Amino acid sequence: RPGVIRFGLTPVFLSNDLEVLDELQAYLTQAVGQEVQLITQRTYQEVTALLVSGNLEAAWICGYPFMKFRDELDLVATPLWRGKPVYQSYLIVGRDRDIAGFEDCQGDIHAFSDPDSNSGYLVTKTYLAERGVSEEGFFRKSFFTYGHRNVIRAVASGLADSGSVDGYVWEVMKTTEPELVAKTRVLVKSGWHGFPPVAAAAGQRKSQAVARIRSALLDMNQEVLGRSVLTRLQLDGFVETTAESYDSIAANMERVRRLG
């Protein structure tokens, strides 16, 4: 009862599903006792600012923002998806597009998710950097959709010739929106990276709320609601991890910088 908790969301899952946004708020307030409010922004960077500055108690964010601000944030918990707390980046093209590999997308109009996304930018940036080109040199046009669901839409609709997307989001939409997703196919799958975690500011790690929150996430599979929420997100639940999960990502950040 003491007040109001601010919990941040990013489109690292289907945050358009208002139904889930509801159940989720429900499970959290019960588990935490106080009223929890879910926050969203237009971009990742915006959420990341609010989180670093402690304006949000915690937030569900991509692995890339977490490592970029590694020092100013700590892990709370990481989703489990199909057994393991990991995911891939999918480079997607049109279903009927006849092409072999990445190199054939030269000259595409390309949809990225967010300049701060691992699966929606960084991974593909790496593929470019290893070939000594940038997006402006390799693609005839590129743009940010500010969300993974949106990348898939862009490709499916024909607005983009190819796209870079969170593979979890793609595999979930393959079942919740199968006709859309069926207008795309996966051209390249990355290696496995740490699943987008929940996290909080480091100079407020020793906090009641985080602990209250860290708890809510691990025990989610133990409530009736929390089990409904998980079913919706197609996740097994949340586990504790350390920064070492996210090394694959930091090493890509390093490859991009060193290759530039």
Author numbering: 45 to 304
From the paper:
The regulatory cluster consists of three genes, aioX, aioS and aioR, which encode a periplasmic-binding protein (PBP), a sensor histidine kinase and a response regulator, respectively. Arsenite-bound AioX is thought to act as a ligand for AioS, the sensor histidine kinase that upon auto-phosphorylation, phosphorylates AioR, the response regulator, which binds to a conserved sequence upstream of a RpoN promoter. AioX exhibits a typical bilobed structure of the PBP type II class. In this class of proteins, the ligand-binding pocket is located in the space between the two domains.
The crystal structure of the phosphate-bound AioX was used to solve the structures of the apo and arsenite-bound forms of the protein by molecular replacement. Figure 5 shows the AioX ligand-binding site with arsenite forming a link to the sulphur atom of Cys106, confirming the role of this residue in arsenite binding. While the majority of both structures overlay very well, there is a significant difference in the rotamer conformation of Tyr88. The change in the side chain conformation is further associated with the backbone shift for residues 83–88 and a significant conformational change in the loop region comprising residues 53–61, demarked by the black circle in Fig. 5A. Interestingly, while the structures of apo-AioX and the phosphate-bound AioX contained a monomer in the asymmetric unit, the arsenite-bound molecule crystallised with six molecules in the asymmetric unit of the unit cell. Although the six molecules were arranged as the three repeats of a loosely associated dimer none of the interfaces is sufficiently large to be indicative of a biologically significant assembly. The arsenite-bound crystal structure of AioX showed significant conformational changes compared with the apo and phosphate-bound structures, specifically in the loop of residues 53–61 and the shape, as well as electrostatic potential, of the protein surface. It is possible that these modifications allow its interaction with the sensor histidine kinase, AioS, leading to its activation. AioX and ArxX bound arsenite with a Kd of 177 and 311 nM, respectively and no interaction was detected with any of the other substrates tested (data not shown).
